[PDB]
Design a protein around this ligand. Structure first.
Ligand SMILES: CCCCCCCCCCCCCCCCCC(=O)OC[C@H](COP(=O)([O-])OCC(O)COP(=O)([O-])OC[C@@H](COC(=O)CCCCCCCCCCCCCCCCC)OC(=O)CCCCCCCCCCCCCCCCC)OC(=O)CCCCCCCCCCCCCCCCC
Ligand SMILES: CCCCCCCCCCCCCCCCCC(=O)OC[C@H](COP(=O)([O-])OCC(O)COP(=O)([O-])OC[C@@H](COC(=O)CCCCCCCCCCCCCCCCC)OC(=O)CCCCCCCCCCCCCCCCC)OC(=O)CCCCCCCCCCCCCCCCC
Lengths: 74, 54
């Protein structure tokens, strides 16, 4: 749920840039947003995927241990 | 002699900016923010009645 929301909020920023593409692209007063919007977007995507990827790794480590340790105890 | 006058063919069109529109104006001003504002709050709610609602 958290990964899906944060992904939708990131997609919301892409709409804000697309809805206002002509201004971010042609108006030089908004050049800093045109240049650094994708850097912030990647850093946000990285946090979203980093957490999902790390959580996924831990779940798999937990699952493979309880199965192995259980057979030893049997 | 004046009645015999004619008219030259003018130019077809001037430059059309590919990044400025009436709904997405390139440059900013309080006039366009006002249009978007009065579209949000809507027009004046005129009452046709003879006494106030309250
Ligand atoms: C009380 C009950 C409560 C219910 C809760 C729900 C409340 C209602 C929610 C309303 C807001 C959401 C809108 C949902 C759609 C509703 C339909 C609608 O818009 O109204 C009728 C609307 C007309 O509006 P109107 O009121 O009749 O008159 C408007 C005026 O004429 C003036 O014309 P105009 O065009 O200037 O007007 C624009 C108009 C309509 O603008 C639009 O064009 C509607 C499109 C909005 C898209 C929203 C972003 C979604 C991005 C795409 C995700 C796709 C995912 C799947 C991908 C699959 C493919 C791989 O207003 C908006 O822009 C609404 C924007 C809402 C704010 C969004 C802010 C996001 C940042 C905050 C994030 C918060 C987290 C949640 C974010 C969730 C995002 C998923 O119909 C249309 O606009 C037709 C559009 C036809 C062509 C669309 C082509 C697709 C465009 C996609 C953009 C792509 C962006 C870049 C890619 C991003 C993906 C990576
Ligand atoms: C499960 C069941 C549960 C649900 C059951 C269903 C029940 C749902 C309830 C709905 C009831 C029906 C709704 C009808 C419309 C709203 C009510 C209304 O009075 O509208 C007409 C009323 C005026 O009537 P009018 O004759 O059509 O207007 C003629 C002139 O244009 C007006 O201007 P004028 O100066 O040219 O003419 C004279 C003007 C002179 O008087 C005035 O103009 C009033 C001055 C107020 C403006 C002063 C500046 C303050 C406003 C700044 C904005 C701040 C809010 C926004 C900022 C934050 C963003 C959210 O009006 C008057 O004659 C006296 C005022 C009316 C009597 C006093 C009412 C006081 C309370 C109304 C405001 C609510 C305060 C918050 C309470 C809620 C607590 C959470 O409209 C307003 O003044 C503002 C309405 C906003 C009301 C929002 C709250 C709605 C809930 C209503 C429930 C009843 C109040 C409960 C509070 C109890 C505290 C003691």
């Amino acid at each position: 749920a958290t990964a899906l929301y944060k992904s939708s909020a990131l997609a919301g920023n892409l709409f804000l840039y697309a809805y206002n593409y002509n201004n971010f692209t042609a108006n030089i007063r908004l050049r800093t947003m045109r240049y650094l919007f994708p850097v912030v977007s990647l850093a946000i995507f990285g946090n979203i995927y980093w957490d999902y990827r790390s959580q996924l790794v831990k779940v798999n480590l937990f699952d493979e241990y309880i199965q192995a340790r259980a057979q030893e105890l049997v | 002699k004046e009645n015999t006058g004619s008219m030259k063919k003018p130019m077809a069109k001037a430059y059309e900016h590919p990044y400025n529109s009436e709904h997405h104006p390139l440059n900013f001003s309080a006039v366009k923010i006002a249009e978007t504002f009065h579209d949000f709050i809507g027009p004046e709610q005129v009452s046709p009645h003879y006494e106030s609602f309250a």
